């Protein structure tokens, strides 16, 4: 009735979304085969936001998996919940991109874009009132960022009123594993700013800084980095599936976050994460949850909001919890610390309370924050673009795909507007 069509692209996008569906299916009591085996009644009431219905009482997700190489479809099909996906939703080309934005955008990713848009137009018109889409990708590869922005351009030229949302994993600066990634990421941010409603920023550097510092894990892997992205991929959409004392969908947080239509890059974070020895030493009350949304170490971007000004702030609270204690603690963070808040917006906080917590938990909390300390995420990409671009470094890999050097020069200055557009609100 308020359906969400999932899109997900690349090896990064197909390995984030495979764990996210293991989070949702347990949250709604769905087995590895698909059948419903829950206990409550609220688990089967708004399941149609994310799940279709097959025959025999078996639920199949609305997920369309996209890739340019054929080797990340076998990883997902034969994983833990790989048998819940309809096999027509998998899209794969028989030759990759190989860390290249141009092969993603023009050469290889344009013969594959017209077969996914025959899939998504079959899943988007099969919704009673489609709320919007989603994306999950990375700005470092070829098919995550090249064709992953070709798709968004075709969506927002075809369904403009609907919500387009992105969970971007923008490239990590100082744990980096590709020389040719700043060409991919700089060329991809003009396509984000004109064709997305919201966009979240995730760095894999700052997902490691949780798993070493906060959780005190011995050997984390990418299975515990996808485990945290799905924690905040479900808290944004938890008031759409479970009732509350105060609701907020994906649109009401978008109405209340962006003041100007070019300023939609945010910073998620999830509160009740506890290390294994400190698990028994903590109790679950309300100020235990607002001390870890707003802690600057907790954030899922590797940029610090003490260097900038919070334009607006969100919060999503889950559990059965008191409306006075919710409300009095967000006034509390506004008043002790009032140089991290913009003047011209007097209240900077939106709050929402959902009743049904994550399974086995009593209370929970989620965050979405908009900053002028996120123009420090693009200037560390600009400094490593024009340091490399001014000597025409890896340029033969891109210009021989059918490009031009002026197409680079505009993506210098279209992203350099967002540096100086955001800059005038710190003044």
């Amino acid at each position: 009735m308020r359906e969400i069509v999932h899109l997900q692209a690349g090896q990064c996008g197909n390995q984030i979304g495979a764990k996210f569906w293991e989070v949702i299916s347990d949250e709604h009591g769905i087995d590895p085969t698909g059948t419903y085996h829950g206990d409550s009644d609220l688990q089967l009431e708004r399941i149609n936001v994310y799940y279709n219905e097959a025959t025999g009482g078996k639920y199949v997700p609305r997920a369309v998996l996209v890739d340019l190489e054929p080797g990340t479809m076998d990883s997902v099909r034969s994983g833990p919940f790989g048998q819940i996906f309809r096999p027509d939703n998998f899209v794969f080309g028989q030759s990759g991109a190989g860390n290249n934005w141009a092969k993603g955008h023009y050469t290889e990713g344009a013969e594959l874009v017209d077969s996914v848009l025959d899939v998504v137009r079959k899943e988007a018109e099969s919704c009673d009132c489609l709320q919007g889409f989603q994306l999950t990708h990375s700005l470092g590869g070829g098919t995550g960022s090249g064709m992953g922005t070709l798709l968004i351009s075709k969506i927002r030229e075809e369904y403009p009123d609907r919500i387009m949302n992105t969970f971007s994993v923008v490239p990590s600066p100082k744990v980096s594993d590709t020389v040719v990634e700043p060409y991919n990421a700089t060329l991809s941010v003009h396509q984000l700013v004109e064709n997305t409603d919201e966009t979240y920023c995730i760095d894999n550097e700052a997902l490691y800084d949780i798993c070493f510092r906060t959780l005190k894990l011995t050997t984390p892997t990418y299975g515990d980095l996808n485990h945290l992205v799905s924690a905040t991929m479900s808290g944004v959409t938890t008031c759409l599936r479970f009732p509350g004392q105060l609701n907020a969908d994906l649109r009401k947080l978008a109405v209340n976050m962006v003041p100007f239509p070019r300023l939609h890059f945010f910073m998620p974070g999830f509160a009740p994460l506890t290390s294994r020895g400190s698990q028994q030493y903590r109790a679950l009350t309300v100020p235990e949850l607002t001390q870890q949304m707003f802690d600057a170490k907790n954030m899922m971007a590797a940029c610090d909001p003490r260097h900038g000004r919070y334009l607006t702030v969100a919060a999503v609270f889950r559990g059965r919890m008191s409306m006075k204690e919710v409300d009095e603690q967000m006034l509390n963070v506004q008043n002790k610390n009032s140089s991290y808040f913009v003047e011209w917006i007097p209240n900077n906080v939106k709050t929402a309370v959902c009743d049904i917590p994550p399974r086995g938990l009593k209370m929970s909390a989620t965050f979405i924050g908009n900053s002028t300390a996120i123009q420090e995420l693009f200037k560390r990409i600009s400094e490593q673009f024009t340091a490399m671009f001014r000597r025409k470094a890896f340029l033969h890999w891109y210009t021989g795909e059918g490009m031009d050097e002026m197409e680079f020069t505009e993506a210098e200055s279209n992203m350099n507007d967002l540096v100086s557009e955001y800059q005038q609100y710190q003044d």
Binding site: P70, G71, M73, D74, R77, S78, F92, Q94
Partner: peptide, 14 residues
């Protein structure tokens, strides 16, 4: 060892 039985296309299989 690599096991690419799921991912090979139906044109090109054994």
């Amino acid at each position: 060892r690599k096991n690419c039985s799921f991912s090979t296309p139906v044109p090109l299989s054994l």
